[PDB]
């Protein structure tokens, strides 16, 4: 059940504006090309539309570098104090784009090194000292509760996604990942929000640490075994559930996956819109990973209903 390319044409966006707004534009274009590549839809959608999309991703990238500070961190403006969140988000989008356009390793691994050497506390927590202006671009992190866990998980996920490129350049990186994992592991069982259970769940699963009681908490947090939701904005629950799908695929829990993909398909969420950045990136990252790892997986006999009338 690949999402039809025709439904995603609005995600091909010309990025523009300052260090936050440029990433708001680059997000949908990068994840749309990622997803149309993995689902092999360019032949039907228009092979010729892919080159234009890549040009816009290159424009995004070149524009974002105007906001790269001497430290290798990012902020909205060159004279604004650097954002831990924005820098880690840049690492997340550039890491995923590396097969689409040429990403400078100096830029990627510079931002990673800065996050580890400037913004990680001795207990493994990542701290934000200069929050982004566009609070709507950070999804479910905008919630006040479980900030240390949710941001440590967000940053750890960016480090883990950059590790292949940056491990051989940043010798502090494996130790930073271990310390961040230690904090998440030590505090996971006390989490109350499904959003944090999901994003900290994916972060731990990437390291093989979502196990035993922590794995049971992750799985039993899902409603009807198909979604991770809190009682607020639906965009946050689409995001939460995308992180939960990424965790399930890391766990190789292939039998738990199909009901979660069905629930995501039934939201008919095609990305874009105010405050859409994290949901757009995460839903298409998670569905692309699903398409790669366990496409059309079937966990029971879907020829027939589960009814067994015995008259």
């Amino acid at each position, epitope marked *: *059940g690949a999402v039809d390319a025709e439904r995603l044409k609005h995600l091909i966006v010309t990025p523009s504006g300052a260090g936050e707004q440029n990433m708001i534009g680059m997000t949908p274009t990068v994840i749309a090309v990622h997803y149309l590549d993995e689902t092999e839809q360019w032949e039907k959608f228009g092979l010729e539309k892919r080159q234009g999309a890549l040009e816009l991703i290159k424009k995004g990238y070149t524009q974002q570098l105007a906001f790269r500070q001497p430290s290798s961190a990012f902020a909205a403006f060159v004279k604004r104090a650097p954002s831990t969140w924005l820098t880690a988000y840049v690492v997340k989008v550039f890491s995923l784009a590396v097969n689409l356009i040429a990403i400078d390793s100096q830029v990627l691994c510079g931002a990673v090194k800065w996050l580890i050497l400037e913004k990680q506390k001795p207990d493994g927590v990542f701290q934000e000292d200069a929050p982004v202006i566009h609070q709507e671009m950070i999804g479910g992190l905008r919630n006040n509760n479980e900030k240390d866990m949710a941001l440590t998980a967000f940053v750890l996920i960016s480090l883990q996604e950059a590790k292949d490129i940056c491990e051989e350049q940043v010798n502090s990186l494996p130790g930073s990942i271990t310390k961040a994992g230690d904090f998440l592991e030590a505090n996971y069982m006390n989490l109350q929000r499904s959003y944090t259970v999901a994003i900290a769940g994916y972060a731990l699963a990437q390291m093989g640490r979502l196990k035993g009681p922590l794995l049971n908490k992750f799985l039993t947090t899902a409603k009807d075994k198909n979604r991770w939701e809190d009682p607020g904005k639906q965009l946050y629950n689409v995001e939460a559930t995308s992180y939960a799908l990424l965790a399930l695929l890391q766990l190789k829990d292939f*039998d738990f996956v199909p009901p979660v993909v069905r629930w995501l398909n039934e939201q008919r969420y095609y990305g874009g819109g105010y405050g859409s950045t994290q949901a757009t990136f995460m839903v298409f990252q998670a569905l692309a990973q699903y398409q790669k790892d366990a496409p*059309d997986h*079937q*966990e*029971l*006999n*879907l*020829d*027939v*209903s*589960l*009814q*067994l*009338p*015995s*008259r």
Partner: antibody
Amino acid sequence: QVQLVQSGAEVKKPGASVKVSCKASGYTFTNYYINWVRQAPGQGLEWMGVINPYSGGTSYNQKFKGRVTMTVDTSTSTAYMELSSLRSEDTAVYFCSSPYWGQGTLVTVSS
Amino acid sequence: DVVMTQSPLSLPVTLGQPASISCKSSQSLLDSDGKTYLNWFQQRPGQSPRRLIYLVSKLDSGVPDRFSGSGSGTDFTLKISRVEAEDVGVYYCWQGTHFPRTFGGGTKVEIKR
């Protein structure tokens, strides 16, 4: 890949009973309901019933109620269909489907 | 019981050309669990059905994307965008919503000459 291997062809007298087996491989046996369907020579298909190998629960076509029994042995991944009081019109290929189909078992009912 | 009606009875096809088959149910196949249990398979003479489509439009694993299924309520269609030689055989639809489960009478896809 997944295979369902069914027992060989049977010749039965009218009034006799037949028990067909279906050995499954290549998937988690208890996760998938097992449909039994028959096809008379040159004809279409008729659903016999289903078993849930997890619970043992069964549902039958009421046309065969009292004459059809479906079981599983989970420790050999085998499903069985027993049909009794056999009639000439019971001559058919019997299939298991879970949802992949077995090769079928011909049951010929004749004196 | 639910009646499944297929059309046409025989469909002569040209290699490389499209094919379309109809399946109509005597009532809606939307289940109370929200899924529509409409299935297609192919049976080539002397053989075990090859599962093609389930839940109206979902291709089974490995089934080539020249196959597609569509429809709702009571009107379903199987399409092959460009017919290949391995696509000949009898096509069945069947429904897994209502009891008993019921099959269409089959559409024979054969090589036109």
